[PDB]
Write a protein that binds this ligand. Sequence first.
Ligand SMILES: Cc1ccc2c(c1)sc1nncn12
Ligand SMILES: [Zn+2]
Lengths: 47, 160
Amino acid sequence: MAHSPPGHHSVTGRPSVNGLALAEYVIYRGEQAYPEYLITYQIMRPE
Amino acid sequence: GTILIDLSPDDKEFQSVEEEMQSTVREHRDGGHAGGIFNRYNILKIQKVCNKKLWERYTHRRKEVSEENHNHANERMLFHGSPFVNAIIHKGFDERHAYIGGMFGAGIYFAENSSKSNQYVYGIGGGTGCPVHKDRSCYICHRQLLFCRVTLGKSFLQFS
Ligand SMILES: Cc1ccc2c(c1)sc1nncn12
Ligand SMILES: [Zn+2]
């Protein structure tokens, strides 16, 4: 794995073309995330 | 040491996790190629992941980050999608769950849009789709996402 940019704990991928997109995030330490909920789902075919 | 506690659909905790799943679906520029064509999900089950060791590992590192950032962990609830979801809930996040060819370099990626994490459940760009039908848009096969507590601390802001 890489390291965060000097002085930083994570990167924020801020969307700058797609109006509707929300942010993506990257951490470089596994210890900086905890998997709190396992969600089991199906995607649904629209009308 | 992991145990999965099944949450009742009548539980407000189930309800607010389902709402974050459903309300953060968007359209994708790939028109559904990677994660399929859908506007919403059938939630089948929501389990709380409980591991003493992985939790203490997380809060240790969160204290380190907050002390480096004016007592601000900058903690978020973010979606993660991976075919190794079962190894993640048991052994926690590490180097083997990094995306090495990612835009922001070799790290562990998370998303505010559930439908973005959904693109990654069968692999990079949806891989070859569900193991049973080889369908990236499978409406039959059960999918799994994680909703994770993520410490961002001081985030480096990269524009597209
Ligand atoms: C480049 C990249 C790779 C994986 C990934 C994201 C972005 S956002 C997300 N949510 N779950 C997995 N992922
Ligand atoms: Zn399938």
